Amino acid sequence: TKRTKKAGIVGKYGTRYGASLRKQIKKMEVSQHSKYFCEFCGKYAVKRKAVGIWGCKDCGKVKAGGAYTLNTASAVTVRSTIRRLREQTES
Amino acid sequence: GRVIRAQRKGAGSVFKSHTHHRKGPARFRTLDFGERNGYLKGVITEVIHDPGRGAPLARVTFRHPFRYKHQKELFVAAEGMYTGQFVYCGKKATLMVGNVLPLRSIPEGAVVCNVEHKVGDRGVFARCSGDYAIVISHNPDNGTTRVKLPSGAKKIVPSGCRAMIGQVAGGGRTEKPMLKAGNAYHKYRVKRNCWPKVRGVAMNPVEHPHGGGNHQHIGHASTVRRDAPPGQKVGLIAARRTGRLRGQARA
Amino acid sequence: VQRLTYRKRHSYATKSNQHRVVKTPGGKLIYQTTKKRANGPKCPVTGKRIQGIPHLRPAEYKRSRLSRNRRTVNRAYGGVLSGSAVRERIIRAFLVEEQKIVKKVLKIQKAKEK
Amino acid sequence: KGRHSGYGKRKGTREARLPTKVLWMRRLRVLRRLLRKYRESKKIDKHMYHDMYMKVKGNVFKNKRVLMENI
Amino acid sequence: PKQIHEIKDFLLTARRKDARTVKIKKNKDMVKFKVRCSKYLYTLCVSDFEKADKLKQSLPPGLSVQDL
RNA sequence: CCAACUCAGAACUGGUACGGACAAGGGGAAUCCGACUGUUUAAUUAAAACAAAGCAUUGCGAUGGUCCCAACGGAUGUUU
RNA sequence: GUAGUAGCAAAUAUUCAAAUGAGAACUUUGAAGGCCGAAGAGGGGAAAGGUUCCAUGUGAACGGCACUUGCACAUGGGUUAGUCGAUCCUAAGGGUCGGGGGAACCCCGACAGAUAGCGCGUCGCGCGUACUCCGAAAGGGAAUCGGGUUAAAAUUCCUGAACCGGGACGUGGCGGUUGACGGCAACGUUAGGAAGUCCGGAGACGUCGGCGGGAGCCUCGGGAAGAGUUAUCUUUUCUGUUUAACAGCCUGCCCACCCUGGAAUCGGCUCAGCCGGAGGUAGGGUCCAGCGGCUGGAAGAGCACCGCACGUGGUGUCCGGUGCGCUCCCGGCGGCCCUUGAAAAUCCGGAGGACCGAAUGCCGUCCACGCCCGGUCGUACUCAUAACCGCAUCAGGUCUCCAAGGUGAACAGCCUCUGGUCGAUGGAACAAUGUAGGCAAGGGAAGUCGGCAAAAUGGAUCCGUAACUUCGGGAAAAGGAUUGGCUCUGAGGGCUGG
Ligand SMILES: [K+]
Ligand SMILES: [K+]
Ligand SMILES: [K+]
Ligand SMILES: [K+]
Ligand SMILES: [K+]
Ligand SMILES: [K+]
Ligand SMILES: [K+]
Ligand SMILES: [K+]
Ligand SMILES: [K+]
Ligand SMILES: [K+]
Ligand SMILES: [K+]
Ligand SMILES: [K+]
Ligand SMILES: [K+]
Ligand SMILES: [K+]
Ligand SMILES: [K+]
Ligand SMILES: [K+]
Ligand SMILES: [K+]
Ligand SMILES: [Mg+2]
Ligand SMILES: [Mg+2]
Ligand SMILES: [Mg+2]
Ligand SMILES: [Mg+2]
Ligand SMILES: [Mg+2]
Ligand SMILES: [Mg+2]
Ligand SMILES: [Mg+2]
Ligand SMILES: [Mg+2]
Ligand SMILES: [Mg+2]
Ligand SMILES: [Mg+2]
Ligand SMILES: [Mg+2]
Ligand SMILES: [Mg+2]
Ligand SMILES: [Mg+2]
Ligand SMILES: [Mg+2]
Ligand SMILES: [Mg+2]
Ligand SMILES: [Mg+2]
Ligand SMILES: [Mg+2]
Ligand SMILES: [Mg+2]
Ligand SMILES: [Mg+2]
Ligand SMILES: [Mg+2]
Ligand SMILES: [Mg+2]
Ligand SMILES: [Mg+2]
Ligand SMILES: [Mg+2]
Ligand SMILES: [Mg+2]
Ligand SMILES: [Mg+2]
Ligand SMILES: [Mg+2]
Ligand SMILES: [Mg+2]
Ligand SMILES: [Mg+2]
Ligand SMILES: [Mg+2]
Ligand SMILES: [Mg+2]
Ligand SMILES: [Mg+2]
Ligand SMILES: [Mg+2]
Ligand SMILES: [Mg+2]
Ligand SMILES: [Mg+2]
Ligand SMILES: [Mg+2]
Ligand SMILES: [Mg+2]
Ligand SMILES: [Mg+2]
Ligand SMILES: [Mg+2]
Ligand SMILES: [Mg+2]
Ligand SMILES: [Mg+2]
Ligand SMILES: [Mg+2]
Ligand SMILES: [Mg+2]
Ligand SMILES: [Mg+2]
Ligand SMILES: [Mg+2]
Ligand SMILES: [Mg+2]
Ligand SMILES: [Mg+2]
Ligand SMILES: [Mg+2]
Ligand SMILES: [Mg+2]
Ligand SMILES: [Mg+2]
Ligand SMILES: [Mg+2]
Ligand SMILES: [Mg+2]
Ligand SMILES: [Mg+2]
Ligand SMILES: [Mg+2]
Ligand SMILES: [Mg+2]
Ligand SMILES: [Mg+2]
Ligand SMILES: [Zn+2]
């Protein structure tokens, strides 16, 4: 059954710290505890070891990523920015 | 009066950095002939956590240029690095995230981290998680480069200074609220003895300029001049302004 | 029921002060200190155990105290790398070396272009 | 024989006296054991074994008898 | 302590120059031949009582034989 | 053939006694203060005081900010 | 003077007989009645003490009454280690060379520098990054186990049986296709080249939760041995019924790994997960743990019981079951972190192959066996309501290990067994006042600054549960019902047999 209407994973904090802080932390609480797709082996077996460190259970590849997500928004932008610059120089 | 808290930190003692479990200094290779002229290939062996440091660190193994032995290194991990990846350091290394290149070979607009201030100092700039520097322009006549630092300041550095392509991994750490005193306790337990902080207005006059009074109040302007002697320099030091930063001030 | 005491002057339950209860031919219980658990050899990266070698304290591997067959594996990098790791390295060494030959020959054909 | 087991002789909660987790573990081990033997004896094919295995995990069969009758 | 399984092997170790003594232990279901050597006490078990007597008189002269 | 102890119900029965000793929340409607957990005047004050997460301001890009030192040097700094 | 006065009162408790003695409520023995009740008033150890340990004796003093007594006094005795520790290693840190400061005492501390030396040949070559220092009787760490023995010591003494680190050579074995053999493989076998250099691993690591395995304990039944109860009942109640290091062989947990094979009508699988064309299920293997099994050790020992003498002999020590049980150890998985939870000594393995024998006798050998060696210091005892500190034999303070049965959710409380103990100066009375513990008609906070104090509520099962709310709570809200004993009924399992 549906155990909580909306609290979800932040139900472990009970009635403490205020609703806004619980709402704010829910995004990162869900993301840092979720499985992520491994580009190397193709499995959803990537979990966070420590802040910024993400290791694949199956293939053993360890990747440096975001604090609470495997890929940050700026990480994607940097890769495209670097790729564009490399093509011009390597032309 | 007595020696205030701010003054007691300089003596060391109970305010020294907690470094028992730290993995060692994270820095580039020592500048040598291989990096100055060509490139040297390294392999990432593991990405590790360094207590007290948000950014992850990468262990890289290099072939020694002239000795029969392996050369171990500890780099600040860039976002996107992974174990088994080949990392190339030198003047002719390609522009890819993770490689270490001199600023002379990095085009304008690139994102870099762990930028050297002096050629061969092995990196002092943009080392914290999620931070980076942006190459602004090059000056072939002076042999210098313009970069934008994380604080938003523009600095001139010689073009020979090395920098790793990409941004520091682990970004977004400070967005998550701590929610608890205990979380702050664990954070600073592995950094230094600076937490918790007692407000000066809660102290007695003997130990802080803000102490005393039948009401908790500063009683004098909290902005103190630059040249105030130690023990008197508390509060907003050499404040150009105060109050909520509205308008162009908060730019 | 019979209650026991430490047989040494170590009065604190540290990891090195572990014990087991033994019943002697005299009909009484007594402690005997037991050595701590040992990991045994492991792979440099994956961390999996190296097969064919018992798990012992470092001093128990001493040549004078352990037969040679129990501390060796009859294969290249035996006791240091697993069989799978050795296989991966051999194929990598051969294939990478072959690719270098292709690169060398490829540039000779372009070098003569003139 | 069931003496001295009334409500007036109970001080701990039902969970304290016998945890619900213990009862659940016994039932799953009993039911999973029964399904394996029927599959081994070829009374049920793996297609039907899979259907029963997950239903047991779903709290459908409360004991060994009801599971047998449904099969 | 080590156990000798073959009577032939027991005789070979009984002729060692470091064999100090041999002791005969007669249980209710077998006879044990124990020879004290420099490093180990070797024991041989002989279930057949009659077969044990033959070995008893085959020991080398000069070796201290005792009955337990 | 061998099993351990959880649950449920019924009859009968005692001077309605039965969590029989032991064990073991009083409850409710509100106001003031502090969000909470934590800490505090060892030997008269445990609190509304301190701390706290959150919020905001200030200085500083190392030829630097803050601080220690008689001098030399040093702490923050295995830091950015 | 006060004054033979204040005072001796917490920790439940003593009684009878006899012995000894000038003298006994206080010593000793026996019997009875109680207490600590395994987070002990039991059995040890670390600090700290230092002879308080043991025997004998004792005029006085001291042990806040007394003493024949003793943690007092006097005389003498007592601490045995290659294996337990220190010793070794490094941690936070400490002490330093050179250098830099400083009138100097001193300050910084490998940071201003021709390091220490090491390795291999036989004095030469090679290597060589400024500490061969101190810092743990709880971190790391070469090796010892039963049985016996004293008035007082023991993993130290005795006996037996092992192991570790060194030194030296001999015999046999092994290899020469100069440096073994077997398996498709995971790997196996007891041996089975090698220098400088290089590489990895072990040592080596947080916390919480669930499962699984091992050991010890608890518990149930049967066999035999002794004891207790016996007017009645009781094939009954109680005590026990043992097996060390070490050596060999077997077993092969939970994982990991290998071979065959090629999977949707998807399958396998945990309490929970989760796994599979990056090769599942299935079939057959390898390896790893053990505080698992058998044998040796080893019944010759120990224990119990029955005899004979006043040392010596005999009998037995057996066969099963049970588990959300308890203590400890291990395995594997999962949760948690803006926290990711030592180092070094030491040991093992590996890459490389300079150099080296024999034409078969030399060389090599981490194999088996035999021979020799084992420093120094600590070790008694208390570890506390009397051996430490608090001026004391002070109701205070002081780290930690072992932990039975019943009731029960429970190392709660209450009672009991092992072990310990009745040590708190005693006797006679039963006024006031007091301290501690209670109860009380009718009223029910009228008492008082104030419900202070006390009373009432309390466990479990079923039902039921509002305002408000940050939607998580509030909540055990509130409110109501049930509860013993006895005799039954139903439901929930395991292992074998096609
Ligand atoms: K002062
Ligand atoms: K602090
Ligand atoms: K504060
Ligand atoms: K003030
Ligand atoms: K092996
Ligand atoms: K609390
Ligand atoms: K500074
Ligand atoms: K002590
Ligand atoms: K010694
Ligand atoms: K030590
Ligand atoms: K440790
Ligand atoms: K002994
Ligand atoms: K041993
Ligand atoms: K001793
Ligand atoms: K005391
Ligand atoms: K009275
Ligand atoms: K009143
Ligand atoms: Mg996989
Ligand atoms: Mg603050
Ligand atoms: Mg104040
Ligand atoms: Mg002042
Ligand atoms: Mg329970
Ligand atoms: Mg549950
Ligand atoms: Mg109001
Ligand atoms: Mg508060
Ligand atoms: Mg306090
Ligand atoms: Mg006070
Ligand atoms: Mg108070
Ligand atoms: Mg606010
Ligand atoms: Mg100065
Ligand atoms: Mg008086
Ligand atoms: Mg008194
Ligand atoms: Mg009296
Ligand atoms: Mg009393
Ligand atoms: Mg008395
Ligand atoms: Mg009591
Ligand atoms: Mg009692
Ligand atoms: Mg305990
Ligand atoms: Mg007296
Ligand atoms: Mg005495
Ligand atoms: Mg004396
Ligand atoms: Mg030792
Ligand atoms: Mg240090
Ligand atoms: Mg000094
Ligand atoms: Mg000097
Ligand atoms: Mg130096
Ligand atoms: Mg040393
Ligand atoms: Mg030392
Ligand atoms: Mg130790
Ligand atoms: Mg003793
Ligand atoms: Mg290691
Ligand atoms: Mg928890
Ligand atoms: Mg268990
Ligand atoms: Mg298989
Ligand atoms: Mg035997
Ligand atoms: Mg006997
Ligand atoms: Mg424990
Ligand atoms: Mg080799
Ligand atoms: Mg002693
Ligand atoms: Mg004693
Ligand atoms: Mg004690
Ligand atoms: Mg004193
Ligand atoms: Mg019970
Ligand atoms: Mg209890
Ligand atoms: Mg009344
Ligand atoms: Mg009344
Ligand atoms: Mg009333
Ligand atoms: Mg009134
Ligand atoms: Mg009145
Ligand atoms: Mg009033
Ligand atoms: Mg009250
Ligand atoms: Mg309420
Ligand atoms: Zn992967």
Q: How was this structure determined?
A: cryo-EM
- Residue position matching structure tokens 């943009």: B126
The answer to whether the CB of B132 falls within 8 A of the CB of B168 is yes
Q: Is the CB of B63 less than 7 A from some atom of nucleic acid strand F?
A: no
Judging by beta carbons within 10 Å of its beta carbon (0-12, 13-18, 19+), is residue E37 exposed, middle or buried? middle
Dist CA B229 CA B6 (whole Å): 12
Beta partners for E25?
A: E32
Exposure on the CB side of residue A47, measured as CA atoms within 13 A: 9
Interface test with B, best of A40, A47, A85, A91 (most B CBs within 10 A): A85
B106, amino acid identity: I
- What is the B205 CA–ligand 19 centroid distance (Å)? 21
A38 labeled part of a ligand binding site:
yes
Residues 6+ apart with CB under 8 A from A40: A56, A59, A61, B82
Compute φ and ψ for B160, nearest 5 degrees: -75, -15
Please name the residue ranges forming H helices in E15-66: 49-56
The answer to whether the CB of B202 falls within 8 A of the CB of B63 is no
Exposure on the CB side of residue E61, measured as CA atoms within 13 A: 0
User: CA–CA distance from D62 to each of B106, D21, D50 (Å)?
Assistant: 70, 14, 18
- Contact call for B and A: 3+ CB–CB distances under 8 Å: yes
Q: To 10 degrees, what angle do helices D46-57 and D20-40 make?
A: 180
Cis peptide before B196 (omega within 30 of 0): yes
Identify which of D26, D20, D27 has the alpha carbon closest to the alpha carbon of residue D56: D27
B148, amino acid identity: K
Nucleotide nearest to B179 (CA to C1'): F53
Judging by beta carbons within 10 Å of its beta carbon (0-12, 13-18, 19+), is residue A78 exposed, middle or buried? buried
Indicate the resolution in Å. 2.4
- What is the C89 CA–ligand 24 centroid distance (Å)? 78
| B186-195 long-range Cβ contacts below 8 angstroms, 24+ apart | B189/B18, B190/B18, B190/B21, B190/B51, B190/B52, B191/B17, B191/B18, B191/B52, B192/B15, B192/B16, B192/B17, B192/B18, B193/B14, B193/B15, B193/B16, B193/B18, B194/B15
Identify which of B48, B76, B56 has the alpha carbon closest to the alpha carbon of residue A52: B56
B48, amino acid identity: I
The alpha-carbon gap from B86 to the nearest alpha carbon of chain A, in Å, equals 13
Q: Is the CB of C35 less than 7 A from some atom of nucleic acid strand G?
A: yes
The answer to whether the CB of B60 falls within 8 A of the CB of B47 is no
Name residues 23-62 of chain A within 8 A of B (Cβ). 24-25, 28, 40, 49-53, 60-62
A41 labeled part of a ligand binding site:
yes
Helix and strand element counts for chain C (H, E) = 1, 2
**Tokens for E11?**
């005789």
Bridge pairing between strands B144-148 and B154-158:
antiparallel
Judging by beta carbons within 10 Å of its beta carbon (0-12, 13-18, 19+), is residue B153 exposed, middle or buried? exposed
User: CA–CA distance from B2 to each of A84, B6, B197, B203, B221 (Å)?
Assistant: 61, 11, 18, 12, 21
